[PDB]
Write an enzyme that holds these catalytic residues in place. Structure first.
Site, short mmCIF file in Angstrom:
data_model
loop_
_atom_site.label_atom_id
_atom_site.label_comp_id
_atom_site.label_asym_id
_atom_site.label_seq_id
_atom_site.Cartn_x
_atom_site.Cartn_y
_atom_site.Cartn_z
N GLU A 144 1.01 -1.34 0.03
CA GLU A 144 -0.31 0.06 0.18
C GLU A 144 1.02 1.12 0.26
O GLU A 144 0.88 2.00 -1.11
CB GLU A 144 -0.43 0.18 0.91
CG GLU A 144 -1.50 -1.06 1.01
CD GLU A 144 -2.68 -0.96 0.20
OE1 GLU A 144 -2.77 -0.07 -0.90
OE2 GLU A 144 -3.52 -2.77 -0.29
N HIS A 198 -15.71 -9.36 -9.93
CA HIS A 198 -15.50 -8.29 -11.36
C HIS A 198 -16.00 -8.43 -12.53
O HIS A 198 -16.29 -7.41 -13.08
CB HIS A 198 -13.47 -8.06 -11.30
CG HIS A 198 -12.59 -8.64 -10.03
ND1 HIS A 198 -13.28 -9.14 -8.93
CD2 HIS A 198 -11.44 -7.97 -10.20
CE1 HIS A 198 -11.57 -8.80 -8.69
NE2 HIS A 198 -10.80 -7.87 -9.08
#
Ligand SMILES: CC(=O)N[C@@H]1[C@@H](O)[C@H](O)[C@@H](CO)O[C@H]1O
Ligand SMILES: *[C@@H]1O[C@H](CO)[C@@H](O)[C@H](O)[C@H]1NC(C)=O
Lengths: 597, 195, 596, 196
Positions: free
Chosen positions: C357, C487
């Site tokens: 991150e 998705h």
């Protein structure tokens, strides 16, 4: 005294009594292949019959010598091949019917002919004219007519015959205590033991299957390349993501992509490593091709061809109106009698062939000192591989330069490199998925995994899926396209042509390293080596007296089949192809066909 | 005092089988060995303990000519201290052999279309032969504990087998005619002398 | 005056209004994620809708500046991005139907519940229950119930919606002069020029194909290994030569094989490297995790986090006083406002995630000064790649040894490394043919090559041919199994996860080269390679202000994607797998199925 | 002898927008600039043509204190020979500038939750500003041949934009308060002097 003592005397007798019987069978079979006629068929049949009778009686008598109390491996092996034989397996009616089916299939293949649609007076056989069309023609419709005509006029005939042939062969196989005819074929690689760890018949399926995936990238890149170049000569007939049409691949089946080389040569401005034209211009004949091959083998320390080889071989098609089998075969008739039978045309293909066949002969000569029963390659692949290993070094442009054929200035660089490795790749890589798919389809048919009702269907699925080659015309079950190749309708196994390829490069790499070759695998030429020759002959002498894995380990220091060497041999070509296909698609879509877009 | 009869040994129309090899005794004679040496038709001419050119000066009490037919591959066994089917069981030369061994390719005469099986050899024997010993017995070979008394069958074989000579045979398997001359050094006067 | 002069002014104004609006939206949205309430969802949808109307308006107006007339590359690029989107193409009525379909597929997925067959009262959701069963179960029939249940109760509901979705999405795409919605999604990799040498949208398909087939040896050997180990635990249901049944693959679709590690570990006696215990012992909290990660980036010559990063990020689950989205994200709101929202636990997994991150954030910072439209990774694969690469170096045994988290007495023999490489291979190598296959099905479905009546028929055919995976139960066309994945049903392109992987290793191999790493690529650690830092910042700072072919060439000295580095990273596992499969079949038969 | 009114300048509750920058003319007084130099509450303090330790020794005919607000990243433009939106179209300093530029972070006063948009700047202008020139026109910028009569679009834009200052802004975007002291060192009686 000792059971093994007695078995050695038994086999002694068996060798001496078997010699003239086999010899007379080879001799008559040979007369038949150099001079084919009904009379000579009769001679082949009775001669073969005495071979069979004698073999039966010996095979039964070998069971008196139980394997448990035999100490020596070559003795136990001979007793094995005798004991696990016999002939009383199929009813006489069924044997006569099988042999007649075999005969029928063979003579259909060798006599079948397709006429032109606009002149039914004018047909062609396969063995000259249709071969010529499929190997040189650049017109789509012509290649279609010959491809389809062959599969329709000759295949459709072979279908019902082939269906019966399978059932019977499978019955015979089950009688011998094999799963199916395919298993019985695969027995050739099987090895007994050591610690209980031997080559089993299923293993060959496993290794073949493993190498197939390991070869996928190189094959697929070769395929993408050939696909884009073919787009230029057959503009509106090739899909840039579709499979490749089967009738466009350079021979009647696409067994070898060699003859695509003029349509795919990377750098055609550079000379020509197809030395056909040079050979012709220089006045080469059959005798030259074979004398030259001989010279090559001599150079690594191996013997000359025997005097009887030159005396009584058929190296060209006769001009006295005898009909013959032009299919090249190397013969170990026995009693030191070694012969080659082929109709030699002055081309580079036959030049290479002549090395391959002379390699068969050279293997036979070297295990001649082994017992009768043990005179055989370590496995079929081994015997097929030796000659090719020789032709690798011969094919090298460096080697070619030294014997005329390429002008002495020449100058090798990376373009001529790529040209050469592309030619080889057409011959060697292009054939691996083909050979694999053919034998797999046979194996599964033998195992009953594919029923009659799906035979062509399944066949073409596998052509689409494994080979990336699509049929130009839809074929229902009246066809029998596997049988329209010589080896399938003449009842020969075909996996030998795949394993051979693998073994060949392992051999080449071992021998090149013994030659102290400084550099890339594919520049190596073991001519004049002698240490190479001695190591190879040390292998050849063993025959089948010893588990092909053990003798393999004695050469390449490995016990296993390995495409590592094939892959390193082509690695230059592979990275080049990688760049050339950056703007092509690589791989194929098994749903596209030329009869339905 | 006239010349030795070597032609009848060498140029004989029929030769014997090795198992029953033929011996001619040469005595009370004078010989020119130069014809033998100047032949140029012999594949093998190996002399032990003597030189072919020295034999013209040498006098010997007796000479023995042994003649038979074997394959080309088997000719190497016709020598001192050799082992093989021929040497073990058919014709054995002593270690102290002094003489010459001559052989030549005999395919035109002794091979025929379809095979010539006139010629026999011995394949099995209870023990190896002694030098210059001949065994012409046709006794069934007993390879097993069970006696075969009568005849052929399992673990008993008939000892003699026939060569089959074809014109297409390989050279090692083609017929060869062998003459072996032994020159013995007797205590008595020499009767076989050279030029 | 000149059309380019007027374009620059239009972009000036656009960037200036866009910055304020974007930030307002990002700010409202962040408040929602860190404080779930109805009030805050009101603010987020209002911010998002002013931002949407502004972007539509600007996009329409962009079409007034012809691209031919523009010479500067950033002006032209901005104009391009503004022109090929945002502007309307569908009618008001059909805009509204497409939106209601999109939101109906999202909520049908988020709320799907599958009930136990003979116990209808107890049911499960994907979020906890089903995810758990598919990750942990060894019960063949339990997994089969979950897999089929999810596909039948959710899939079949999505099928009509997914069909009308393909039509409307295609209609918009073609409105923009793309050939179908798949071609639209591929414009991310498109690049203009040098001399017509630009990356074209078909070239992506060619590349993804070439890579697919060059990965075939490694995948089929891995697959082979996994098949024989699965046989030990599913004796009756695994054919030695067939595809792997879809429901035994470790999660609800087989997207990762990670959870199969306990079933297929090479050496079970060697200890896995898990420093969670070791971190708890040393009293570590989440702040320590992020400070170590920051230390890792500074150690390669990248900047420390901003003070705003530390005051403003949500690093821990927020004191358990508010409802919050714990899914880890890295936020570039705008105006130098960089944040991380993550419910950090003192675990090894969370430790690594932190580096992933902060990699995302490091990328954000490097390109913070480019124009708004160019504050992005060179293409969709780049950002996530950068994150993955960071996690690589950091997770090596040497890194943990120098940190104090792993004992120096730990022994890195050849066995430990094989266990590690196989766990990597499950995750990383597993997902490639899955991802290739899925996006290929969708590209084909968009372009019209797969008609409705064969959607599922081809889906399964592709699963069997490309993935070597076979459905356990047959499915007719009432099903829409693609859509039972997040998705697919939420309108996200999926191929990014393929390109990401390819790029990650291209990055890694290059950077380790530069860090003079002597040894195996999988044991590389770019820490204190300020040189690598410099080449990495070079790449990061450009954003997507340059053809990604050029920036990619600047880092790895290659212009085109390569699996070379990935193959080479995994090569020790490869040669090992080859000896292991010596007495097994490799590859599959597409005809065999559990039910036939 | 009474002191200069720098307190009103520096300690003002709100500053003006850069586009309409505020100027106070300082005359007839005595001031201690050591307070400014030794303040340690200024992020930026750069002097041109004069030395700060030594302007306590100097007397000037006039001193101009200009004050406005810009973002942190923009402070660099308050210097001679600079280019940017601010220097080109808002506040321009001459090349031969004699004076000091002082700035400090103003986040606590001038940023508010939800954003402070009180402060405006000029985004477009037909030519760059001349040094010390102030332009407060609110004229639609006409970037095309087509005349703009008003409103917006069709290549016509409203020249002034509003800063949005938030507490969560990055440092480069946070508000900064700038005072530019100019010493009019030319001629006449000097009445603005520094004591010690
Ligand atoms: C120029 C001026 O007056 N200042 C400044 O002195 C005082 O210490 C501060 C706090 O009250 O304000
Ligand atoms: C055998 O006959 C040939 C031809 O007549 C002759 O050349 C040869 O010398 C003869 N040999 C003997 C030993 O007489």
């Amino acid at each position: 005294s000792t059971t093994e003592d007695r078995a050695k005397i038994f086999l002694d007798n068996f060798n001496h009594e078997a010699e003239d019987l086999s010899y007379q069978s080879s001799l008559a079979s040979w007369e038949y292949n150099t001079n084919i006629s009904d009379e000579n068929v009769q001679k082949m049949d009775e001669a073969g019959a005495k071979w069979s009778a004698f073999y039966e009686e010996q095979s039964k008598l070998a069971k008196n010598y139980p394997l448990e109390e035999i100490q020596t491996v070559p003795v136990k092996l001979q007793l094995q091949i005798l004991q696990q034989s016999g002939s009383p397996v199929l009813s006489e009616d069924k044997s006569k019917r099988l042999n007649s089916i075999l005969n029928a299939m063979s003579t259909i293949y060798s006599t079948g002919k397709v006429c032109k649609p606009n002149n039914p007076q004018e047909c062609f056989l396969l063995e000259p004219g249709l071969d010529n069309i499929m190997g040189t023609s650049k017109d789509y419709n012509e290649r279609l007519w010959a491809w389809e005509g062959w599969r329709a006029e000759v295949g459709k005939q072979l279908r019902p015959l082939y269906e019966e042939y399978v059932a019977l062969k499978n019955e015979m196989a089950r009688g011998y205590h094999y799963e199916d005819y395919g298993d019985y074929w695969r027995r050739d690689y099987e090895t007994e033991e050591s610690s209980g760890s031997g080559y089993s018949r299923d293993q060959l399926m496993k290794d073949v299957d493993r190498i197939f995936t390991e070869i996928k990238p190189l094959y697929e890149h070769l395929h993408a390349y050939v696909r884009t170049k073919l787009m230029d000569t057959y503009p509106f007939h090739i899909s840039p993501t579709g499979c490749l049409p089967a009738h466009l691949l350079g021979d009647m089946w696409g067994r070898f992509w060699t003859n695509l080389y003029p349509l795919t040569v990377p750098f055609g401005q550079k000379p020509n490593i197809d030395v056909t034209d040079a050979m012709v211009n220089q006045g080469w004949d059959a005798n030259r091709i074979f004398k030259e091959a001989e010279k090559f083998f001599v150079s690594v320390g191996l013997p000359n061809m025997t005097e009887g080889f030159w005396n009584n071989s058929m190296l060209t098609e006769p001009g006295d109106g005898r009909k013959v089998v032009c299919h090249p075969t190397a013969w170990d008739l026995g009693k030191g009698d070694f012969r080659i039978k082929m109709c030699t045309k002055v081309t580079m293909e036959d030049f290479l062939t002549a090395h391959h066949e002379m390699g068969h002969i050279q293997y036979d000569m070297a295990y001649a000192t082994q017992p009768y029963l043990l005179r055989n390659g370590a496995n079929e692949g081994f015997h097929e591989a030796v000659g090719e290993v020789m032709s690798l070094s011969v094919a090298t442009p460096k080697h070619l330069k030294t014997m005329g054929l390429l002008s002495p200035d020449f100058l090798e660089d990376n373009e001529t490199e790529i040209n050469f490795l592309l030619k080889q790749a057409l011959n060697i890589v292009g054939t691996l998925p083909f050979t694999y798919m053919l034998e797999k389809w046979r194996w599964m048919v033998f195992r009953g995994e594919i029923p009659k009702e799906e035979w062509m269907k399944k066949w073409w699925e596998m052509k689409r899926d494994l080979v990336g080659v699509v049929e130009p015309v839809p074929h229902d079950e009246t066809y029998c396209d596997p049988a329209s190749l010589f080896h399938v309708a003449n009842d020969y196994s075909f996996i030998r042509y795949y394993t051979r390829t693998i073994f060949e490069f392992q051999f080449h790499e071992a021998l090149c390293r013994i030659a102290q070759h400084d550099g890339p695998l594919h520049k190596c030429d073991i001519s004049n080596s002698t240490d190479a020759g001695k190591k190879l002959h040390q292998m050849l002498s063993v025959g089948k007296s010893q588990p092909w894995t053990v003798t393999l380990k004695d050469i390449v220091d490995s016990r296993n089949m390995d495409v590592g060497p094939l892959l390193r041999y082509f690695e230059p070509l592979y990275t080049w192809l990688q760049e050339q296909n950056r703007k092509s698609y690589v791989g194929w879509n098994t749903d596209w066909s030329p009869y339905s877009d | 005092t006239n010349l030795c009869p070597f032609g009848e040994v060498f140029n004989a129309t029929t030769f014997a089988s090795v198992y029953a090899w033929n011996r001619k005794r040469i005595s009370n004679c004078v010989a020119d060995y130069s014809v033998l040496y100047q032949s140029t038709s012999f594949s093998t001419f190996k002399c032990y303990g003597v030189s072919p050119t020295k034999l013209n000066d040498l006098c010997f009490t007796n000479v023995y000519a042994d003649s038979f037919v074997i394959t080309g591959d088997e000719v190497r066994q016709i020598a001192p201290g050799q082992t093989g089917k021929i040497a073990d069981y058919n014709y054995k030369l002593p270690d102290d052999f002094t003489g010459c061994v001559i052989a030549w390719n005999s395919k035109h005469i002794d091979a025929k279309e379809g095979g010539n099986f006139n010629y026999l050899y011995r394949l099995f024997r209870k023990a190896n032969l002694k030098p210059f010993e001949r065994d012409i017995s046709t006794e069934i070979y007993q390879a097993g504990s069970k006696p075969c008394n009568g005849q052929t069958g399992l673990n008993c074989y008939y000892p003699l087998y026939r060569y089959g000579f074809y014109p297409t045979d390989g050279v090692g398997h083609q017929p060869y005619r062998v003459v072996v001359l032994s020159f013995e050094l007797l205590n008595a006067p020499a009767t076989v002398c050279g030029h």
